[PDB]
Design a protein around this ligand. Sequence first.
Ligand SMILES: [Ca+2]
Ligand SMILES: [Ca+2]
Ligand SMILES: [Ca+2]
Ligand SMILES: [Zn+2]
Ligand SMILES: [Zn+2]
Length: 370
Amino acid sequence: WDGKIDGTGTHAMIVTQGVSILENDLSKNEPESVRKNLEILKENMHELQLGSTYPDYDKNAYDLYQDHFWDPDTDNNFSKDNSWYLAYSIPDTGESQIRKFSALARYEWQRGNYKQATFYLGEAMHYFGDIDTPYHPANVTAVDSAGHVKFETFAEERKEQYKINTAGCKTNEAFYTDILKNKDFNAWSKEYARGFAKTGKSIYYSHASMSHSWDDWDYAAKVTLANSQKGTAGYIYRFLHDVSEGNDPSVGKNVKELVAYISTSGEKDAGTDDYMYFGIKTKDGKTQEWEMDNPGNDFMTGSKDTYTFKLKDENLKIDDIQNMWIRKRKYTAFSDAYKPENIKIIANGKVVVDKDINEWISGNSTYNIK
Ligand SMILES: [Ca+2]
Ligand SMILES: [Ca+2]
Ligand SMILES: [Ca+2]
Ligand SMILES: [Zn+2]
Ligand SMILES: [Zn+2]
């Protein structure tokens, strides 16, 4: 969907309505903590809205042109065994971004950083809105500097007439209750989001593609925006319950992948063009290393980069991973020191490592996170 850097536009409307939806569907018997956390969210509305639009204008990334259209089955294909060269990190998808920002949002909320938590939640919903955008051509036709397309700008001009204020039921009813049953957040998110994304693809072929009439387009915007709002409300509801009842999705399950969220210091020359790797060592002495390389310019000064690592051994618990590290290898003979500011490691929807560093890493050296 379309959006503007100041927290306005289609994206902002979606999260704003997601809140109103909850304000209306929330049953009276709901735990007061849930209702109280909803109120904290509402008073941080401007941050939720800013976060909901930020990913299309994020300048602390890889210096790449924005393109947020993925085939709904991408995440599922990446999750399958054998289908990926493990030495390489897995590319970020709309599906994975929802999970990452959700984990970061939960972590921040538990420690009282409501403003940051809400912003992160906004970013998670931004990506959910995207996968719910009915635009799936093989070849994209961008119309603005932020990578938006004509179907999104069309919906943008009409956003007000697509607003909904209810999911169609109360939180004690099926839609909402089903969302709480699956205690495995990452597993629930995958199936839940995939449903909206696939319906989105169907709508692209039957109503939103360029060859369809304006009437078809209006209808497509209407039904996918309703879906986006409802779906967003569902994610916010789950977040509220997760942070209120102190829920942890990683609870004793196998760690199939690890996600590194690395914040490079804003200091001059903090970034690096040298080869960068991440590695772990298990309690039993096993080791695995991955190359941290995404399509763009990795580890730029002041960037917040994400790397998804798929593990060899799929029978490991989080406590089985004893050490973790990042390692630099010189690209050229010339110096190019690297200064990470903070590194967060996420395992099964939980932020398991949050280490401030602010030290220069130079030459061919290994820096131990743990
Ligand atoms: Ca670089
Ligand atoms: Ca790269
Ligand atoms: Ca440098
Ligand atoms: Zn969008
Ligand atoms: Zn986007």
